[model samples]
Target chain A: LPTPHEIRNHLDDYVIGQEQAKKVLAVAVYNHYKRLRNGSNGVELGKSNILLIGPTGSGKTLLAETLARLLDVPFTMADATTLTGYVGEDVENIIQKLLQKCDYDVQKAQRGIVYIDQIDKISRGEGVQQALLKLIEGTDTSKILFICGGAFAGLDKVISHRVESEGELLAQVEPEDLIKFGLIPEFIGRLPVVATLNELSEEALIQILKEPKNALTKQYQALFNLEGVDLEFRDEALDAIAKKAMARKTGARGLRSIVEAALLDTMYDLPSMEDVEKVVIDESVIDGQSKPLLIYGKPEAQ
Target chain B: LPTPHEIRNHLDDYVIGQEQAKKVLAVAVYNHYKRLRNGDTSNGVELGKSNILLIGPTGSGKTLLAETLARLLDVPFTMADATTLTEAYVGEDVENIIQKLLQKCDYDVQKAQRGIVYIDQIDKISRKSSGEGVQQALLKLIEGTDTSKILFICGGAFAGLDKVISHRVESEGELLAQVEPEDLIKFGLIPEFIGRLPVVATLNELSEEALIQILKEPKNALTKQYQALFNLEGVDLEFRDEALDAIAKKAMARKTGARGLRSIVEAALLDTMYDLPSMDVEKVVIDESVIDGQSKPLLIY
Candidate 1:
């Protein structure tokens, strides 16, 4: 396993800014490998189940997914409401799903990562029950890393007048406070590692859409390239998209849908265009106020 | 007016609890420069050349003391290892240390000659034949050469050198007091070679108490490190006494030093830092159980 520093550096190549969350998850991930390799230890080192607090499109799920992919481990993600309790058939199904993912191998399944998203939706008696509490409390759930995430959307407004700032509120969030936030103490206690993911800044969102190795812009660039049309995103276009993504309240995740809507008409007409050489996207295109500026190559080529 | 006493007093604020070595360093550094001032005069009077050998355990902050001394004096100080100084043709020679000092003092030949050079891991030279040659090579530079007015201080953990002194003196636990030069000669050092080092000071071992001081109190302490990092994100980070005690004891039982406290705090705050930006709080406080994996630090939102 790579060291936490190495893992975080590798994460930097794909994920942008969330240095705090990157380091937090990096430590837990490295520790998880240490536990996996703790090898005939004198005493078992307990696995650190983590709680991730952040809004969607803020890289909360992406960080988890990226690290799991990096390690080539079996990772399964499901919503909190879907993994309900009562008899816990859905809970057993997730383990069964994990075991299936690791190629029907029970031993390999034990080391898999289980990500439960939208965790704030689950309440004690309604969605989760005492059964999950026992499983989380380490009765026998040995090697699997349970990384649970939630926006905890309104948690800030509840204490906004008391504290006055967003950063100070999250860093100091107490377990008893999380208990009142709706999770039971037993569930909250199991997740000792609490990491916060920030709202994606305009810069981070722009980087998310255009800067990474396989960014949304690169994906579209390749698609346009396939049909022999060059695609260009102007600086103002990127800024306009990021601003719109922020207003949508989905962080960087909204970047793709917005880009897709803007590009839909251009993509459909690309194959039929007789001399279209390039399509330039400016702020008007992002604002849905104008069509793309299409440039032509030559009359001879046309 | 950075007098010797003033130097020591300034050191007290940046470094905590380690008094003896700091005082000795303050005096030796000031006196060496004082003699340098006297030597520059046309008069014939001279004081014999002096250099130091610092004895301490690994991670005992010998380097911290040395670094602080150099910073306070605003003098050029460069470090090199003695084990790699064997007199083989391909190996490094003693002049390389002087060359490094030359660069650090901005190539002012006269100023560079008077710069401080700390030779680390010198004890490794005593037990081996080729290693002794390295020590012999460093002699003129350490004593005095026409081209240099350098102050040399060598340090070694000298792991079992405590035994060499215990035989000569009535000791409790370890070789516990002022080391006479003879004890070092018996500890496998060359007699003629060791005489060049007239000043000897032993840094205190890295213990629980010192590790505690390293955490929160010192300037640029790891405590301050986390605070600055948190502040960049607009956090008012606070560390509690009970939390420090918890981290300090864990590092002590692991038998680690200043480095241990750093790693301990890094792991302890890993969670809070990850979630810090997403948090909406004015402040956060780290308590005792945070180190125990007992709970996340309490936050004020």
Candidate 2:
């Protein structure tokens, strides 16, 4: 089993920020597998289910998915809304689907990670919560780690109310506040650790666009490369893209959209411009002030 | 074929408010099918294709309207994100989007041609010069290249268009101004692209009353859904009119329109849902006091 730091390092490859969330998840996952490996001599060390709180597009699901990938665990993502008898399949079906991921290997399925996305949808603790509580308490699930995530849209109101009552600027979130926000006490208790992800800043969004293995800029570059054209994104152009994405307030989720909007015309016209060997994306291109600077052939010198 | 009034009536069963948008869409869909049936030669003249464009804030029933239309029309519909279309890696190209539409119709070219392609987040394509490329690429699809039979409906929040509109209003010095399709061209959409989407409609911002009606009046209202869940547990769930109003008020404050109603209602009823099954409580009445965060529901055995 890898140490918490090692797990975190692996997470950094895909997820851009949320260091605190990464640390919390890393420690919890490492300890989970550790307990699984070193039997507790029949004393229940207790599984630590984690609750991830963040805004949409802040990489909550990505963090969970990357961790599961690193650990080579059977990770199944189930929507909490569907678990509560919504329009989709029921809770038992969700578990059966998880078991299917492990190919009916009961032991492997028992030790897998079950990530419930949009858990805030079921914060009301309806039949879905009861169903989840049973699954959490199942004798076979002591080793399974449950990671629940939610945007918790109105949770800021709960936090602000706490701040107003306490006369504090920065109010720390407590389990009681989560209960007040609609999560059942028992459900909160089962998920002992709660990690909050910070909203991605402009710098973080830019880094996300270029640094990740599946960087949007790199992807676009690869597409351009397929047409035998070298695509170079200037620093100013990247900054402009990042700024536009930030304006949307959708966080990293808006990056691809902005980049796509910026590169759409270039990609469409590239095939017809066979003479163009190199294209430079600059601030002018981003600002709609000028078209992409196209070179007809290889340059002679700097 | 359903008339415009019949289509509007069907929409009311699912979505609340936006009557004008519903009416326009009904007419557009009606005409689309009519043209398809008459082979574009109705009244001894060629009837040009009329595509729709919906502008509204997030959670204001744009997607639901399109979905309900497809359900009513009984045609195969595919919702493609405009953002994904711009990304070569993350989402497949326009061809793949059509392919998915074809697959949905069981690969029958005839059925696929009569399908609806709803493009979402179209405002994302109004960025800089790059958007021009995406718009041009879409022109071929929208103008009926390879598949002219498919009807297109595009929707977007167009987050920053308000600033552009305000600027124009301020410059023109008009107290009351009507939005022209030409105004969209200033928001980075090419004039040609705007011309193609002839039938444009904007949904009204949902009011508190509208939100309240959404909670109670809709066929699949959140209150009814919660009631169904409680019923399965052998408990009666009832919400007072004032409690429903209070819930709608909170949802209105959230500014997420109809979507916010679910979370507000869910938060108010969490404790009851958690404990009702175990307790011998047979009936729970959610009142104004319960919604005000002052008291729990009145439980009757």
State the lDDT of candidate 1 residue by residue for B58-92, as single tens digits: 56766556766777778877766565464345333
Best by DockQ: 1
What is candidate 1's lDDT per residue for A169-278, written digit by digit as tens? 77655554564466644466467677887777888887887878779889998998888777888878888888888888878777888988998878888898754455
Clashing pairs in 2: A265-B133
Q: lDDT tens digits, residues B127-184, model 2? A: 7545667887887788876567888999987766666777776522121125567568
Question: Compared with the true structure, what per-residue lDDT tens digits does model 2 show for residues A1-302?
Answer: 67666777898889888876787777667656766665522123556588898888889888888888888888888888766522223655667788888889988887788888998887643435645765675637667888989988777778777645221311245565675576654467577667788888788877887888889889988988899887888887888877887777888887787777767777788899664554545555457656677777745435
Query: After superposing candidate 2, which stretches have Cα over 4 Å from the reference?
Result: A1-302, B41-44, B87-92, B163-177, B280-294
* Count of clashing residue pairs in every prediction: 11, 1
Can you tell me the CAPRI class of model 2?
incorrect
